[PDB]
């Protein structure tokens, strides 16, 4: 409501302090608008990590996903942020969530060559044979994008 | 012996009017220039015989409606005259192959950058992503624009193949619409895949994406010459250019023909035909309005040649060289609506690509295939 719009604003904004006067007049750490967004998909694309943790500790659902099929690690993996992707696997988060197009973070991470991100979602159990809509799987995203050094790392399929 | 000039209030009718002025120093035919509000809706309410203005100004587009009903006279300029003009825009006053109006001006859609955070601007969309990224860790936006009308997305929807009506020498088939096609679910996906990812949003409007820009907050936006002059008011240190290539293939604007046509029930035809061919379509007739009330790119090759040493000018001109002349049939009005309809939707995850464009290929008047 009020608040809620305010909370997804300042985690966009990564207004920590902000963040925190929120929570303590009763803002909606799950609020959700329109398309599904939640202020830790906020935090997670922006990359403001002392964010994420304090959404999660107040309850924050790890796996939630927007309209598109995107979860709070989806944007992190896409967006280079291996810190939160990290936090985000600790709490719980689906290291083989797709989106409404099939694609999982580790998809999203091939895309630009996150070969640390690739490594912490390979060991949380990334699924590498996953394939998505358009029947392809994280190796075939990193040919797709010219990325030949992930592309060679990822042929352990 | 009096000409009546219908034009807009934002035009320079006052240059305009100093044409008029000349013709009425050679000829002794009292000149008249208007610029009623409503004057477009109310032209085919006063015109429809009566009387009305002898000459009216206005966008193209809507002088398909009015040779519809018989409300303009058919021009008919000669070989030589013709080639004064840019070929392309005789193509947008035309109406069941009959030429209905003069071309005027040209208006197009181009790429606004900040030189000062964008030296060189992206050739193509496929780049955006990476830069926004890029961008976004310097506390910067690569992209904003006005994604609520159909008008600022098409460019990019179209790029790839589709189209509004089908244009074939002279004529649209009205049956033929090309937003189900796909080259325009390949755009729209595009386009989708950028709010998805967050590169931008999708309830950025037109004062959003303005103001931002404007206040140095994203490096590019897209919107056509009556944008500039605010943002010399900003200061901000920009450039216009030619839009970004999707697939290879150069977005194609829209593009809008300021025309004057000529009033069917008019009495004094010769007159309205001598006025516009031999004084207004000159260089100095057009610099005459121009200096009033800048026209952006012109279809007088003459002068659009000296207008364009001014590179915003030579980007509309390339812009619009390359765009889809807007339809000027009654079948468009359903088209906005449509077209606007399933792209807000597909960009809100409402609908998906297919299901929104195939709704608005039906809504357009067109037959899914």
Same mark, same amino acid.
């Given at each position: ?68 099929? +995107? ?42 060559? +996150? ?30 994008? @010219? ?11 | ?27 002794? /035919? ?21 009387? @009305? ?177 605010? /943002? ?15 697939? @290879? ?87 906005? +609506? ?32």
């Amino acid at each position: 409501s009020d608040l809620g719009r305010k909370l997804l604003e300042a985690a966009r904004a990564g207004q920590d302090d902000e963040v925190r006067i929120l929570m303590a007049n009763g803002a909606d750490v799950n609020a959700a608008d329109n398309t599904g967004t939640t202020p830790l998909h906020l935090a997670a694309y922006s990359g403001h990590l002392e964010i994420v943790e304090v959404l999660l500790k107040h309850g924050a659902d790890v796996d939630a996903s927007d309209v598109f099929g +995107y979860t709070p690690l989806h944007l992190a993996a896409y967006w280079g942020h291996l810190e939160i992707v990290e936090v985000l696997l600790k709490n719980g988060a689906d290291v083989n969530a797709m989106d409404s197009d099939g694609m999982t973070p580790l998809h999203l991470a091939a895309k630009w060559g +996150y070969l640390e991100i690739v490594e912490v979602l390979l060991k949380h159990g990334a699924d590498v044979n996953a394939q998505d809509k358009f029947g392809k799987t994280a190796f075939d995203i990193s040919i797709d994008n @010219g990325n030949e050094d992930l592309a060679e790392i990822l042929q352990k399929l | 012996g009096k000409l009546v000039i219908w034009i807009n209030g934002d035009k320079g009718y006052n240059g305009l009017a100093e044409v008029g002025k000349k013709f009425e120093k050679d000829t002794g /035919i009292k000149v008249t220039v208007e610029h009623p509000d409503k004057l477009e809706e109310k032209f085919p309410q006063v015109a429809a015989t009566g009387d @009305g203005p002898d000459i009216i100004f206005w966008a193209h587009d809507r002088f398909g409606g009015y040779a519809q009903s018989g409300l303009l006279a058919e021009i008919t300029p000669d070989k030589a005259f013709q080639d004064k003009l840019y070929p392309f825009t005789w193509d947008a006053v035309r109406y069941n192959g009959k030429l209905i109006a003069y071309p005027i001006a040209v208006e197009a859609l181009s790429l606004i950058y900040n030189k000062d955070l964008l030296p060189n601007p992206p050739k193509t969309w496929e780049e955006i992503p990476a830069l926004d990224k890029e961008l976004k860790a310097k506390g910067k936006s690569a992209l904003m624009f006005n994604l609520q009308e159909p008008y600022f997305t098409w460019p990019l929807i179209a790029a790839d193949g589709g189209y509004a009506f089908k244009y074939e020498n002279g004529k649209y088939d009205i049956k033929d619409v090309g937003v189900d096609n796909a080259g325009a679910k390949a755009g729209l996906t595009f386009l989708v895949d950028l709010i998805k990812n967050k590169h931008m949003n999708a309830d950025t409007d037109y004062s959003i994406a303005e103001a931002a820009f404007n206040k140095g907050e994203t490096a590019m936006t897209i919107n056509g010459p009556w944008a500039w002059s605010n /943002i010399d008011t900003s200061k901000v240190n920009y450039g216009v250019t030619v839009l970004p290539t999707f697939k @290879g293939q150069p977005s194609k604007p829209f593009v809008g023909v300021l025309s004057a046509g000529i009033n069917a029930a008019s009495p004094n035809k010769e007159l309205a035909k001598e006025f516009l061919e031999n004084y207004l379509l000159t260089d100095e007739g057009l610099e005459a309005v121009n200096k009033d009330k800048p026209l952006g790119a012109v279809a007088l090759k003459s002068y659009e040649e000296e207008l364009a040493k001014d590179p915003r000018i030579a980007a509309t001109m390339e812009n619009a060289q390359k765009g889809e002349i807007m339809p000027n049939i009654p079948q468009m009005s359903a088209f906005w +609506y449509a077209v606007r309809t399933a792209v807000i939707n597909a960009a809100s995850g409402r609908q998906t690509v297919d299901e929104a464009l195939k709704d608005a290929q039906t809504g357009s008047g067109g037959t899914p295939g």
